[PDB]
Amino acid sequence: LEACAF
Amino acid sequence: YTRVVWCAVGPEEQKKCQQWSQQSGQNVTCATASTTDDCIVLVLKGEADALNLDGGYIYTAGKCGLVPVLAENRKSSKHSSLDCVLRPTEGYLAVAVVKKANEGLTWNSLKDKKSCHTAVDRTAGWNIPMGLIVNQTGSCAFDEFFSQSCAPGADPKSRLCALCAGDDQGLDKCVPNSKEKYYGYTGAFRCLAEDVGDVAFVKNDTVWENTNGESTADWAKNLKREDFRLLCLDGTRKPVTEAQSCHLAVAPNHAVVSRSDRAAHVEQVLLHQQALFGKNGKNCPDKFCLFKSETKNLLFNDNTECLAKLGGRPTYEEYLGTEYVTAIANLKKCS
Ligand SMILES: *[C@@H]1O[C@H](CO)[C@@H](O[C@@H]2O[C@H](CO)[C@@H](O)[C@H](O)[C@H]2NC(C)=O)[C@H](O)[C@H]1NC(C)=O
Ligand SMILES: *[C@@H]1O[C@H](CO)[C@@H](O[C@@H]2O[C@H](CO)[C@@H](O)[C@H](O)[C@H]2NC(C)=O)[C@H](O)[C@H]1NC(C)=O
Ligand SMILES: COc1ccc2cc([C@H](C)C(=O)O)ccc2c1
Ligand SMILES: *[C@@H]1O[C@H](CO)[C@@H](O)[C@H](O)[C@H]1NC(C)=O
Ligand SMILES: [Fe+3]
Ligand SMILES: [Zn+2]
Ligand SMILES: [Zn+2]
Numbered sequence: 001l002e003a004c005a006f
Numbered sequence: 007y008t009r010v011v012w013c014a015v016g017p018e019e020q021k022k023c024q025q026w027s028q029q030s031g032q033n034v035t036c037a038t039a040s041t042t043d044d045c046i047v048l049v050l051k052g053e054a055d056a057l058n059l060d061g062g063y064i065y066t067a068g069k070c071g072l073v074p075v076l077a078e079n080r081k082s083s084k085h086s087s088l089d090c091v092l093r094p095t096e097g098y099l100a101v102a103v104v105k106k107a108n109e110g111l112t113w114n115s116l117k118d119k120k121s122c123h124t125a126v127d128r129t130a131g132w133n134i135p136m137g138l139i140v141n142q143t144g145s146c147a148f149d150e151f152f153s154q155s156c157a158p159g160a161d162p163k164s165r166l167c168a169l170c171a172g173d174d175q176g177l178d179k180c181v182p183n184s185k186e187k188y189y190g191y192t193g194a195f196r197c198l199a200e201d202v203g204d205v206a207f208v209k210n211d212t213v214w215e216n217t218n219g220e221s222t223a224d225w226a227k228n229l230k231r232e233d234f235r236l237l238c239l240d241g242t243r244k245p246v247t248e249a250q251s252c253h254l255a256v257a258p259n260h261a262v263v264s265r266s267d268r269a270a271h272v273e274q275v276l277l278h279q280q281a282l283f284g285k286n287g288k289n290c291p292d293k294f295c296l297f298k299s300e301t302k303n304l305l306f307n308d309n310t311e312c313l314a315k316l317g318g319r320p321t322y323e324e325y326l327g328t329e330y331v332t333a334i335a336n337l338k339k340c341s
Pocket of ligand 5: 060129
């Protein structure tokens with residue numbers, strides 16, 4: 001529930 | 007003005023995109039990748055501008071900064087004088103579908119059965135049923151709940167890919183694109199129609215559009231609605247006419263996303279393209295129909311009447327809704 005997954 | 011670069015997921019989508027590009031005089035051109043996540047990355051790099059996404063993918067894209075632009079709007083259930091482009095979207099019903107002949111099977115006896123999902127990370131095929139199952143079982147081991155599944159995008163050696171079939175040649179088993187026979191809404195419903203799985207996680211429209219002659223596709227053309235039942239969360243089974251009272255969730259409609267800096271241009275180009283190629287568009291059916299692909303839901307769902315403007319210039323969280331975003335976040339804690 002926070003950062004871009006790439 | 008600039009051209010808009012669409013991202014096509016897999017080669018069938020690429021073919022349709024190329025026809026669109028030709029017809030639009032290269033106002034739209036095409037990039038292609040093998041999965042939706044890789045398309046999301048092309049957009050983040052600036053090597054494509056936009057694509058239309060299921061809500062679970064909108065969550066991945068939105069976490070990475072991409073924004074919703076226009077949403078699919080299908081035929082309204084109620085009377086509206088509003089033009090399609092201005093009508094608020096209604097969401098679609100995620101459902102669990104089984105064969106009427108598989109008589110003992112309910113929501114509460116799904117453990118160790120065979121399942122068919124649209125793909126990992128999509129709303130009705132995955133985030134809603136697996137989020138519910140994690141919660142009800144109190145366990146993150148959702149990869150050990152069903153005995154075998156087809157869940158495109160999972161590890162091809164794992165139980166979650168055991169039922170997937172790949173392409174004509176049996177290549178690309180379990181890839182999350184239309185090359186996989188059991189991909190997407192229609193692939194997952196085909197997985198149940200052929201009794202490869204005991205249950206399919208799709209949406210209500212899928213069942214109607216692929217039964218009772220609504221599809222002439224070989225695998226669908228003989229299916230009868232009355233041979234299916236929906237699984238309700240209270241443990242009952244209903245006829246597929248009762249989806250309004252026997253669904254898992256109401257999902258936010260698929261929608262186009264783009265970088266924030268190209269959203270207004272993408273919006274303008276799409277409104278004009280759908281005027282040419284949309285339902286009743288100036289050049290559909292004569293030359294090209296943007297929202298047809300012989301039931302295979304390529305680029306857009308076949309049941310899309312138009313892409314509609316969004317109210318409230320919503321962020322991705324606003325567009326998905328807080329409850330759904332929260333549900334996705336909870337499920338992703340498991341992996
Ligand atoms: C389940 O989905 C089907 C298919 O979209 C819906 O039935 C269609 O509804 C529209 C709007 O009423 C009709 O004009 C179409 O003719 C129907 N299509 C078919 C193939 O029958 C149905 O309304 C949906 N059920 C619920 C509860 O939303
Ligand atoms: C699975 O359970 C979690 C935990 O109960 C649910 O998360 C809650 O959702 C409600 C309703 O939106 C919120 O008010 C709570 O803040 C959420 N709790 C937590 C700890 O995040 C989640 O909605 C459930 N998943 C599904 C698919 O129903
Ligand atoms: C209370 O939270 C919401 C917010 C936005 C929503 C939008 C939609 C439609 C289907 C959409 O986003 O396309 C449905 C439900 C929603 C619930
Ligand atoms: C191509 O885009 C330009 C600029 O909006 C416009 O003049 C033309 O009508 C467009 N044509 C098609 C066929 O999409
Ligand atoms: Fe979806
Ligand atoms: Zn409901
Ligand atoms: Zn807002």
